[PDB]
Write a protein that binds this DNA or RNA. Structure first.
Ligand SMILES: *O[C@H]1[C@@H](O)[C@H](n2cnc3c(N)ncnc32)O[C@@H]1COP(=O)(O)OP(=O)(O)OP(=O)(O)OC[C@H]1O[C@@H](n2c[n+](C)c3c(=O)[nH]c(N)nc32)[C@H](O)[C@@H]1O
Ligand SMILES: [Mg+2]
Ligand SMILES: [Mg+2]
Lengths: 485, 725, 726
RNA sequence: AUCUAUAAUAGCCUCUC
RNA sequence: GAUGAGGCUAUU
RNA sequence: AGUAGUAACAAG
């Protein structure tokens, strides 16, 4: 039967095989290069590379969040006492007067002698937290009769182009700093030699990661989400000031409490997991929003003062933004430390491989080299169109930053893009290994990839990076086409 | 409290609804209403826990005197609600810090398995940690040790008898064997105030076995599976010595595996006897020398006897077939693969043993003499003993002989493969199959007149002596000194060979206990992939010196100990032909001055064995060189292979998944050199692929080509070329 | 300056070796909001579109619109097609049978025996199940009990026999009852000023006709799936009722029996066993490649796998497989595909229409979808409703004869896919194909002499799959030379590589309780070390991160720390009061002493010796109130095994009557367990009433106590009088 | 030689755009 | 409002 | 507003 049916089946029913060539691999998401579309704006919950933390030396005593903020503001009394605003940038639908009034209320509540971080439900606080904006539920019959009640047209994420601030964030978050934010707890003493090897390797790995800016940003996110979840459960019908706080340690062992701003929590009656609580964030920064205005459409910025870090003083602005979060986002932010693992396990694996090739532990050789082996280097980036190499620790930091951005900018768009681009990556790897890959519908796979590139900054930057790396791979393969030929 | 239960039942029966539920719900349907729940269970318990821990009183309290001991508040913190009382985690902490002090006997009793686990970990020694390739195989292994192991049904029956004898049901005969044990348990739990379900699950932990598919490498005993996470990874090994005691069966299996590995490594060496002795003297089974293990254990296989002879011990010609103890008396057998038709009609590949053999057979208490021939059980003389043991021994002997009747006596379902596709020993599968259904085997075997001699009497299938008995079986009322030769063959004083290296089984098995070799060349005892990776790593390490010797020297570079170890994983049939081919290819590469480093590295190890050329004086031509074990263990002459691949663009050599760099140890001009000059012996690239010659020629076509004639060759897809002799 | 490009890592590392970095599993998984009616309508429309060229008729039993694509015209293009040919399916099944003699017979015999020894309570093992009495979703046990009670109302007492066969016969007979009486839940609404509406549910008798009951029994409740990775758009899942689940079990058992003996099936093997089987198959295919030829691997997924598979083809499959079985078993196996052929899809909660200026919103339910003009719906919803009109039922449901709504016959679909893989050749052409199948995922290994012949074989396999109703995804499928591929999200590159990212979500706090969560986290770390290629340093870092997350979740930071909190003050006092501080648990502010070597030792056992006697006694108190007791039996677990009172108190709902039924059942079961101590450990067996068994047990207990001297004269007389009264 | 055997609940992973 | 199947894990 | 994304929350 099968033979007869195939005989009488139309030839148009075909898998249409097509041998894959480097030329057939075109850049993904061309629309990200046209300038008609706006550049993707900054939409992360908190500032990452533009964050400015007010540092107060601490004696190791975690007194309280409100007390910590009070001490930090007392140290920087000039910023705290700033009462007249100088508006630098304003969001399209924001009320700068109400935002400044809410900021002043937060500062006063934090600085007051009272031990409660509650804010009164004033007009400006009510506007900022979106009080009384839910639609009234009416009966089915009245709505059916009412001809003005129609199904709302869905809002689709808009299309944006590549923005340089994503590349700047990637560059800055993977650089080493002088502050350690990780607070890893102790483990049991090592007995087995494998445990000693693990501890010795952890020395290098944790030293590399802990000193990078991405680690501090991750710790800030984790702590803020923990505090926000606790406040949302505890204070459902209250407006609460939640300071954005972190704890860092200098290379000399001295600890500092860092205040990055203040957050206002709206009413938190989150019955469902996707129910939204509004958070109004006021974050200190040294970045002038006018250097690139396309990055801050969502932020109302006031210039609140100045600070001294060297002979030259630096301005201090207050980035104010209305934002939202749900219980799922808070829970997943409380456990962002897992990013570490995803970065370590990868690099760790590489080290292990080298050990198997050398007969001894190669962590020290990989990180810094030894008498017999030179340091291991990875293609890390481009400088004026030329490939650049970097150390093992630099690659580890880059992967950790990649995981952190997966968390920060993670949504359905990133998931779909990751899956489809993973398929394309497997095809590219098959091409590199001279396995003669074949495809059936390459345009379909490209359309699947590009359906997910709408406005996620990380997805757009990933498409740009994929295009650059694909061009470099084509250039490299051009030399592989003249072997035994 | 029977009267209290009766009163409670009456009070419940006062309620009309409870009355109708009790009257209309059957005992079978109880299991339904036990699960009756009005609301769906909340999802995402991680988020739910993170959310609830921020509440005031998320925990439920058990009303009683103990609950009332908890104060309403403690230093300004409300521990409990002032319906269902609820408390906060602070209440748990308060109880832990100021609560009443109770007795801890119940915890110690219930969790004795975990305390034994802790003791096993504590009384353990840790050896060195080695870095190198580790080949791990996924096998079904036991997770935790058990003093007594029974299947879940038997364990459940035993638990029911121990804890709930009243409502136990039918006294299954399968519990008979454990009756004594039950009493013991009923002695220990006579006055225990612990909830019966916790004790039942303690008993299940102590009895029921948990077997899982895990990746292991050389240590499958449950004591080693507990530490599996620390024993090894994919690139490192950790020597571990668990505490406690180990079974004799595990030691016997481990020493059998060790002896087989030692013999396999030694046979390919010059003077195999000396190398075998040297390796055996440095072998340790877990934490005991191999020599001591061989001396102590009364058993083993051919390899164990060979190693005993090499070490100066006395050979023990003993064999185990699950529940049989067979001691050789005379005769020699040879195992040959053959396709046998089973009674079910499915053909199976089985290793049939030929020749005539005499065995002293023991099983439990039953003893006998077994006279066996090829595919036929000739005779079996038995002495009176326990009837059950007698019949079990009879059926075990019948299955062992591989008689045609036994193969034809199968009527049912037999699984010779597991769910993972791994092969199961057909002989043991048949033994297990016929152990529980010996009636069909006896019926198919046949019967004959019972012997009428003075001391010879037969036995029928009815479990008793009778005038009718199954063919062959007859009831009756009634050390060797050898020298091992150079090639690991044992010979009697008369000179007849009783054992040899070829008689050692080629099956690769995972030792139950960890085996160590206190020699720098321990890696030579590894699997095929580990040996290949280590050999190629060594070749890469000494690449410059090997190149220098090759360009200056002619044949001295082909002899090394690393290549000797590599030769053990090349099947002996193809070793000489591979060596001839590789030597010819390397010589042609050197003489013609067209040298490719990647191919030189790939083919150098194969040049160790003495060459074996064709009858016409030319070497064999190959497309791939196959290695022992698995279908993925081969080296491709032209293209890459799962074990060996080269990337000229990046100049990266991938060996068994590990990437190494040839940068520096390479000449860029080699990228402009053709691969066609280093794929066939005596062939050199003549020019472009000429369509006139036609289709590409095969290996057999190449071998028959006369000297000086061209041929079209496909190095790999999209890269044709024409070569000449 | 220098710009970081993470993709440049792939220049130094192959994609498979660094595949873990391509999974963004540290981010939040997608969730669905609001109604799933749009997705359900889209699924219905697509399922009917892929079969619109088949025979359309009107069901004589329910009056629904039925579409039959089987034996329909062959596809003329590459669009998804449900026009499977019965002859080709039977030929593939015959090929499978003759490659595997006795496989179908053995599978049917095993399934028959399992069904013969299967009880009704097996139906309580599912999750949320559609309840027809309330037309809602209820726990599987609740739905089963409600169905049993309703059947008892309608003179259907098969469930009393205990076996599943009498219960399924009862379902079949219930399909014939001219009228059905049952118990339903009705809500009384009260005005609580704040005004809010308070709902009080209560049980009331209700009656429906034969046709309504038949449609309800065939109905599938549809909802939206949440927390799904790798997908841009949300999708709809469905759940069936008790009637369908009663028969799906035997078909699934038969299909599993078949699949377990097929070397091309990726099911039911999973994990390490699946990895071993796949590696063995790949090695066998590599060794079997003809000399001098080429072997090519196709990584493929099937597009519209569920929409295009037809229940009629599954009925034919069941008939073919159970060829040598007794008639009753053949009918029993045929029931489930018959039910799926006449399935009805419930379209969900409906849609929401809003007035932006007036700030109003209202939920139009599925029955009233067409009560408003289609112009008041948005563009996509309007088009979907227009296309749905022909298959719409006036009661708010849709006719969905074609397709399988969601993964109910995974094993049978795998059998069909493997049968497709078993042809291996078309027209004696010079190629041979084999492969591995797991539901819609497959890997096809084609051995030939050149690449063109391999492509011809792949095309032949594609067309053969088209003949069987299987549509290979040309967009998501690709091929290369054998040695590298992907299957079921497992990446093979000269061996299967470790994918650590997929395990990341399991590294958090489980959310059971303090001690259970500690054990689960340690065991997760250990198992990821064993299986997912996690190194010792990464394992120790995971231990540290789990300890930090655990302390922050349970507010049990170190005792010497200065952290503030209600629990922390008591933790500090305990830390001050304790001498053997190393013996304190992490939940009690004690130090963490876990490392790689002791990941398998429970925390209490690990610290048992180091505990101070007073703290040890307090923690392991047999009568501690935080763990439920039996009733006073001793509990050996510590105070940290507490339970959270999961009160699913839906806002503005007061269950003053349904909780009463729950409590009545709980009291009855508790008394039964008190009378029968082994009930919890072992499932009690018996076709008699619980009351009779309990009465006889109590009578025996009283008599034996009297004979042994445990009970005196007066108490024995009272017990006998009470028993006689009962 | 683990092939057999295996109660329930919960979690994590994998499998229409 | 959160389904089916498979694997693994913890507990009773 | 905002979160967010084919449909919801912005209390009931
Ligand atoms: O687990 C494997 C092996 O280690 C184990 N085994 C074998 N011998 C022992 C002892 N003595 N102690 C503990 N464990 C032991 O049994 C498994 C056998 O694996 P494998 O190497 O594949 O077995 P072999 O290749 O020897 O063939 P097999 O049929 O399985 O026989 C195993 C065992 O039985 C002997 N034997 C059976 N028959 C029918 C034999 C025969 O006809 N002639 C001879 N000479 N021997 C026969 C084998 O020789 C072995 O003793
Ligand atoms: Mg799929
Ligand atoms: Mg796939």
């Amino acid at each position: 039967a099968i033979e007869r049916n195939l005989a009488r089946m139309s030839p148009l029913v075909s898998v249409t095989p097509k041998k894959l060539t480097w030329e057939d691999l075109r850049p993904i998401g061309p629309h990200i290069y046209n300038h008609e579309l706006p550049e993707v704006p900054y939409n992360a919950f908190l500032l990452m590379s533009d964050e400015l933390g007010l540092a107060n030396m601490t004696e190791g005593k975690s007194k309280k969040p409100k007390t910590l903020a009070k001490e930090c503001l007392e140290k920087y009394s000039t910023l705290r006492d700033q009462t007249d605003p100088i508006l630098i940038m304003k969001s399209e639908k924001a009320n700068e007067n109400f935002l400044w009034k809410l900021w002043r209320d937060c500062v006063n509540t934090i600085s007051n002698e009272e031990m409660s971080n509650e804010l009164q439900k004033t007009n400006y606080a009510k506007w900022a937290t979106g009080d009384g904006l839910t639609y009234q539920k009416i009966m089915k019959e009245v709505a059916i009769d009412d001809e003005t009640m129609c199904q709302e047209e869905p809002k689709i994420p808009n299309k944006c182009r590549v923005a340089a601030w994503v590349q700047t964030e990637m560059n800055l978050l993977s650089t080493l700093t002088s502050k350690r934010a990780l607070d890893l707890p102790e483990i049991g003493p090592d007995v087995a030699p494998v445990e000693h090897v693990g501890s010795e390797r952890r020395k290098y790995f944790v030293n590399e990661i802990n000193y990078c800016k991405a680690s501090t940003v991750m710790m800030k996110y984790v702590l803020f989400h923990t505090s926000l979840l606790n406040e949302s459960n505890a204070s459902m019908g209250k407006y609460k000031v939640i300071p954005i706080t972190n704890r860092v340690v200098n290379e000399k062992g001295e600890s500092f409490d860092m205040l990055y701003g203040l957050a206002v929590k709206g009413q938190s009656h989150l019955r469902g997991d996707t129910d939204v609580v509004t958070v109004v964030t006021f974050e200190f920064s040294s970045t002038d929003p006018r250097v690139d205005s396309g990055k801050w459409p969502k932020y109302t910025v006031f210039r609140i003062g100045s600070l001294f870090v060297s002979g030259r003083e630096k301005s201090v602005y207050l980035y104010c933004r209305v934002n939202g979060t749900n219980k799922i986002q808070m829970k997943w932010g409380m456990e962002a430390r897992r990013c570490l693992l995803q970065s370590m396990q990868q690099m760790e694996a590489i080290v292990e491989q080298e050990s198997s090739i050398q007969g001894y532990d190669m962590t020290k050789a990989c990180f810094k080299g030894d008498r017999v082996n030179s340091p291991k280097t990875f293609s890390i980036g481009t400088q004026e169109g030329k490939l650049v190499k970097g150390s093992f620790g630099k690659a580890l930091r880059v992967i950790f930053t990649k995981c952190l951005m997966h968390y920060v900018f993670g949504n359905a768009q990133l998931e779909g893009f990751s899956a489809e681009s993973r398929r394309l990556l497997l095809l590219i790897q098959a091409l590199k290994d001279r396995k003669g890959p074949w495809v059936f519908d390459l345009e379909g796979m490209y359309s699947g990839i590009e359906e997910c590139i709408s406005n996620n900054p990380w997805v757009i930057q990933s498409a740009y990076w994929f295009n650059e790396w694909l061009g470099f791979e084509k250039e490299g393969s051009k030399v592989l086409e003249s072997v035994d030929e | 409290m029977t009267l209290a239960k009766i009163e409670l039942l009456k009070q419940l029966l006062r309620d009309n609804e409870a009355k109708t539920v009790l009257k209309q719900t059957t005992v079978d349907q109880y299991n339904i209403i036990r699960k009756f729940n009005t609301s769906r269970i909340e999802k995402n318990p991680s988020l739910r826990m993170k959310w609830a821990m921020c509440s005031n009183f998320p925990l439920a309290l058990t009303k009683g005197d103990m609950a009332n001991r908890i104060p309403l508040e403690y230093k300004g913190i409300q521990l409990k609600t002032n319906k269902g009382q609820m408390c906060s985690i602070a209440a748990v902490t308060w109880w832990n810090t100021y609560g009443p002090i109770g007795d801890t006997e119940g915890f110690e009793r219930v969790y004795e398995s975990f305390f034994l686990r802790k003791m096993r970990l504590d009384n353990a020694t840790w050896g060195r940690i080695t870095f190198g390739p580790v080949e791990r195989v996924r096998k079904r292994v036991l997770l935790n040790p058990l003093t007594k192991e029974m299947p879940p049904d038997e364990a459940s029956n035993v638990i029911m008898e121990i804890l709930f004898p009243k409502e136990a049901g039918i006294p299954r005969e399968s519990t008979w064997i454990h009756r004594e044990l039950i009493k013991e348990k009923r002695e220990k739990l006579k006055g225990t105030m612990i909830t019966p379900i916790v004790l039942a699950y303690m008993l299940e932990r102590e009895l029921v076995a948990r077997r899982r598919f895990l990746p292991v490498a050389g240590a499958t005993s449950a004591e080693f599976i507990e530490m599996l996470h620390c024993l090894q990874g994919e690139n490192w090994r950790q020597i571990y010595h668990p505490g406690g005691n180990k079974l004799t069966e595990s030691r016997s299996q481990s020493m059998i595996v060790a002896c087989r590995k030692i013999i396999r490594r030694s046979i390919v060496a010059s003077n195999p006897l000396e190398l075998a002795v040297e390796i055996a003297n440095k072998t340790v089974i877990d934490t005991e020398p191999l020599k001591s293990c061989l001396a102590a254990i009364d058993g083993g296989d051919v390899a164990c006897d060979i190693i005993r002879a090499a070490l100066g011990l006395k050979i023990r010609q003993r064999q185990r077939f699950g529940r049989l103890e067979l001691k050789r008396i005379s005769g020699r057998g040879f195992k040959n693969d053959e396709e046998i038709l089973i009674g079910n009609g499915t053909i199976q590949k089985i290793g049939i043993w030929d020749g005539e053999e005499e065995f002293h057979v023991r099983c439990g208490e039953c003893r006998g003499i077994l006279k066996k021939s090829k595919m036929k059980l000739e005779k079996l003389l038995i002495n009176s003993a326990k009837k059950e043991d007698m019949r079990d021994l009879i059926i075990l002997c019948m299955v062992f002989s591989q008689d045609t009747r036994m193969f034809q006596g199968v009527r049912g379902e037999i699984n010779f493969l597991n769910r993972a596709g791994q092969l199961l020993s057909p002989m043991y599968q048949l033994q297990r199959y016929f152990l529980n259904r010996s009636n069909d085997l006896f019926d198919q075997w046949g019967y004959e007149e019972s012997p009428k001699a003075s001391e010879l009497h037969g036995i029928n299938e009815s479990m008793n002596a009778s005038d009718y008995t199954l063919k062959g079986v007859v009831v009756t009322r009634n050390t060797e000194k050898v020298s091992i030769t150079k090639n690991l063959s044992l010979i009697k004083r008369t000179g007849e060979v009783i054992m040899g290296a070829n008689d050692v089984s080629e099956l690769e098995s995972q030792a139950q206990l960890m085996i160590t070799y206190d020699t720098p060349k321990m890696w030579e005892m590894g699997t095929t992939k580990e040996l290949v990776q280590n050999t190629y790593q060594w070749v890469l390490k000494n690449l410059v010196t090997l190149k220098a010797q090759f360009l200056l020297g002619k044949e001295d570079m082909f002899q090394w100990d690393a290549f000797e170890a590599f030769e053990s994983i090349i099947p002996q049939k193809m070793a000489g032909q591979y060596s001839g081919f590789a030597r010819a290819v390397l010589k042609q590469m050197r003489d013609q001055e067209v040298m490719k480093t990647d191919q030189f590295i790939k083919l150098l190890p194969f040049c160790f064995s003495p060459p074996k050329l064709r009858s016409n004086g030319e070497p064999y031509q190959f497309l791939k060189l196959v290695l022992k074990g698995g279908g993925e263990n081969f080296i491709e002459v032209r293209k890459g292979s799962p074990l060996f691949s080269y990337n000229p663009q990046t100049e990266v050599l991938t060996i068994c998944g590990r990437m190494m760099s040839l940068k520096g140890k390479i000449e860029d001009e080699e990228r402009n050199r053709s691969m066609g000059n280093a794929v066939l012996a005596g062939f050199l690239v003549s020019g472009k692929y000429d369509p006139d010659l036609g289709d590409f020629k095969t290996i057999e076509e190449l071998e028959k080509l006369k000297p000086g004639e061209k041929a079209n060759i496909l190095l790999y897809q999209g890269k044709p070329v024409k070569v000449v002799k | 300056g220098m710009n970081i490009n993470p993709y440049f890592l792939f220049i130094d590392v192959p994609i498979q070796a660094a595949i873990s970095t391509t999974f963004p599993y540290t981010g939040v998984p997608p969730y669905s909001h609001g109604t799933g009616t749009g997705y359900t309508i889209d699924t219905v429309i697509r399922t009917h579109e892929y079969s619109n060229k088949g025979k359309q008729y009107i069901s004589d039993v329910t009056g629904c619109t039925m579409v039959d694509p089987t034996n329909g015209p062959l596809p003329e293009d590459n669009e998804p097609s449900a026009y499977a040919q019965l002859d080709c399916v039977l030929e593939a099944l015959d090929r499978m049978d003759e490659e595997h003699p006795g496989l179908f017979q053995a599978a049917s015999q095993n399934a028959m025996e399992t069904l013969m020894v299967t009880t009704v309570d097996k139906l309580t093992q599912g999750r949320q199940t559609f309840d027809w009495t309330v037309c809602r979703n209820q726990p599987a046990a609740t739905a089963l009990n409600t169905t049993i009670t309703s059947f008892r109302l309608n003179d259907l007492n098969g469930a009393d026999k205990g076996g599943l066969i009498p219960f399924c016969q009862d379902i079949i007979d219930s399909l014939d009852r001219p009228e059905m009486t049952f118990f339903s839940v009705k809500n009384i609404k009260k005005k609580l000023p704040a005004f809010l509406i308070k709902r009080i549910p209560m049980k009331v008798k209700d009656k429906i006709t034969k046709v309504e009951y038949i449609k309800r029994a065939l109905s599938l409740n549809t909802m939206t799936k949440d927390a799904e990775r790798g997908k841009l758009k949300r999708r709809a899942i469905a759940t069936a009722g008790i009637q369908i689940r009663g028969f799906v079990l035997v078909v699934e058992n038969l299909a599993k029996n078949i699949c377990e003996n097929l070397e091309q099936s990726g099911l039911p093997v999973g994990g390490n066993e699946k990895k071993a089987k796949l590696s063995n198959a790949v090695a066998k295919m590599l060794s079997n490649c003809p000399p001098g030829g080429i072997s090519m691997t196709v990584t493929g997924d099937n597009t519209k796998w569920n929409e295009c598979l037809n229940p009629r083809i599954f009925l034919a499959m069941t008939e073919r497989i159970t060829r040598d079985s007794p008639i009753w078993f053949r009918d029993f196996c045929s029931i489930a595909p018959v039910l799926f052929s006449n399935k009805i899809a419930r379209l969900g909660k409906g849609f929401m229409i809003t007035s932006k200026t007036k700030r109003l919103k209202a939920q139009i339910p599925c029955p009233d979808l067409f009560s408003i003009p289609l112009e008041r719906y948005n563009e996509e919803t309007r088009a979907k409703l227009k296309k749905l009109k022909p298959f719409f039922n006036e009661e708010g449901t849709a006719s969905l004869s074609p397709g399988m709504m969601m993964g109910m016959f995974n094993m049978l679909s795998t059998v069909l896919g493997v049968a497709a893989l078993g042809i291996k050749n078309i027209g004696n052409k010079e190629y041979l194909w084999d492969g591995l199948q797991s539901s819609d995922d497959f890997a096809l290994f084609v051995n030939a002499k050149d690449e063109e012949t391999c492509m011809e074989g792949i095309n032949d396999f594609y067309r053969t799959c088209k003949l069987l109703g299987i549509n290979m995804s040309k967009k998501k499928s690709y091929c290369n030379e054998t040695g590298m591929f992907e299957f079921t999200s497992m990446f093979y590159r000269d061996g299967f590589v470790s994918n650590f990212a997929m395990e990341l979500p399991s590294f958090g706090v489980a959310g059971v309780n303090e001690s259970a969560d500690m054990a689960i986290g340690m065991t997760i770390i250990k198992n990821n070390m064993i299986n997912n290629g996690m190194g010792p340093a990464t394992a120790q870092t995971a231990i540290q991160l789990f300890i930090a997350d655990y302390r922050y979740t349970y507010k049990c930071h170190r005792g010497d720390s200065k952290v503030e909190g209600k629990r922390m003050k008591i933790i500090k006092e305990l830390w001050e009061n304790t001498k053997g501080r190393d013996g304190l648990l992490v939940a009690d502010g004690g130090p963490n002493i876990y490392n790689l070597r002791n990941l398998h030792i429970p925390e209490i056992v690990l610290k048992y010796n180091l505990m101070d006697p007073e703290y040890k006694g307090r923690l392991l108190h047999p009568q501690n109130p935080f763990v439920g007791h039996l009733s006073d039996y001793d509990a050996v677990s510590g105070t940290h095994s507490w339970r959270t009172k999961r009160n699913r108190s839906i806002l503005n709902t007061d269950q003053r009557n349904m909780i009463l039924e729950e409590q009545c059942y709980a009291k009855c079961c508790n008394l039964f367990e008190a009378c029968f101590n082994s009930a919890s450990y072992r499932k009690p067996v018996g076709q008699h009433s619980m009351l009779e068994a309990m009465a006889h047990r109590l009578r025996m207990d009283a008599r034996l106590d009297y004979e042994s001297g445990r009970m005196s004269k007066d108490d024995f007389e009272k017990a006998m009088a009470h028993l006689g009264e009962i």
